[PDB]
Symmetry: C6
């Protein structure tokens, strides 16, 4: 219950909001959240890549989003 | 029970205290805690970004805060 | 239940899709997913090496794949 | 049960022993353990900052301490 | 159940296969898997050292191995 | 059950074997295992410091040890 991560990612996915996912190695990825589960997020643009959440620092939308 | 993280973050959120969140990659973020849950914190200023706690080193308020 | 990681990796394995596995240390590996379990993925080419998921940032297929 | 971390940190807190907390990013912090819980330690000096244990390498007291 | 890590490491141990264990800090170790458990692997050559799995990126055998 | 980490560390502690603990940040520590629990090891020499296991890569004894 009392989850914030699910509502957040689900909004970004539903509204097709472009995001930057900054990784713990300094790599910045860019795409749309196509899908997400317990341990991974699927980020689309050219191909859909599987990002491990443990590797993510911050999810930054290109636009403000509201829950 | 016996939690310290929840009371701490909830105070920073309630009192809108400006914080620095230092990440494990040396990146320093700055904003207000808008919201927080089990695995993430939502830090606001320009847009509300989702920070993974596993990526956080230290939360540093701009002012002393008391529990 | 509601898993996305298993369907994703199983597709890449079944269709023998070439992938890049980017590690949290900046190392890029390349091979085919031969096998995967709870904590590891087995990536084949010259020899089959065991990659720990906690060390993985992103799995990137050489081709789009559909679930 | 059979805990060593709690007795250790509680001693440092009770005796107000100055410590260095070395982080996994090479950052050295310095303060007094004001408080600690399951996932975080609160280190005081100028303001009380919340340090995530997953970000900590070693806790080093300025003086020997005994359990 | 459905484990792949145990069968893999147990084969390398049984057949005394020389391996490279690449760590998340870029350090490459070399030895034989003497033993392994839930959280650690014991790698032998000059002395038997205890490697934490959370620190391991990939296990790479010097020869192909089959399960 | 079927633990290898406990027997290993307990031997090093009992026999006062000098060890190098290599950390995931490249820092090499040196001391004697004074004590250990679920998440930490206490390494003695000048003062007894608390090392978090999640920060440890490998434990390397100065001498071979047998279980
Ligand atoms: O139910 C869960 C379990 C894990 N995680 C995320 O996956 C990461 C990887 O887990 P592992 O490294 O313990 C965690 O740090 C956390 O951010 C979740 O979002 N939900
Ligand atoms: O109930 C929980 C679970 C996890 N965490 C935090 O989320 C991080 C990511 O978990 P994962 O990497 O195992 C943990 O290190 C811890 O700081 C909490 O604050 N509360
Ligand atoms: O049932 C599980 C448990 C763990 N993991 C992955 O293995 C990583 C290593 O777990 P540990 O570091 O807590 C996790 O971050 C997560 O990505 C899974 O995919 N499924
Ligand atoms: O009951 C607990 C749970 C976790 N931790 C510490 O918090 C860290 C973050 O947990 P997460 O990254 O799985 C762990 O590595 C461990 O050092 C504890 O001290 N006690
Ligand atoms: O039953 C288990 C528990 C953990 N691990 C490994 O030990 C690592 C350290 O766990 P901790 O960092 O949550 C995990 O990422 C995973 O690779 C296993 O192989 N089996
Ligand atoms: O019963 C346990 C739990 C955790 N750990 C170690 O503590 C580390 C920190 O746990 P946390 O980061 O999930 C794990 O990776 C593992 O090496 C153990 O040795 N035994
Ligand atoms: Mg690092």
């Amino acid at each position: 219950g009392h989850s914030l991560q699910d509502p957040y990612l689900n909004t970004l996915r539903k509204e097709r909001v472009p995001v930057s996912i900054y990784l713990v190695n300094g790599i910045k990825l860019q795409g749309q959240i196509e899908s997400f589960a317990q341990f991974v997020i699927l980020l689309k643009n050219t191909v859909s890549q599987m990002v491990y959440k443990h590797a993510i620092s911050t999810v930054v939308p290109s636009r403000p989003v509201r829950l």
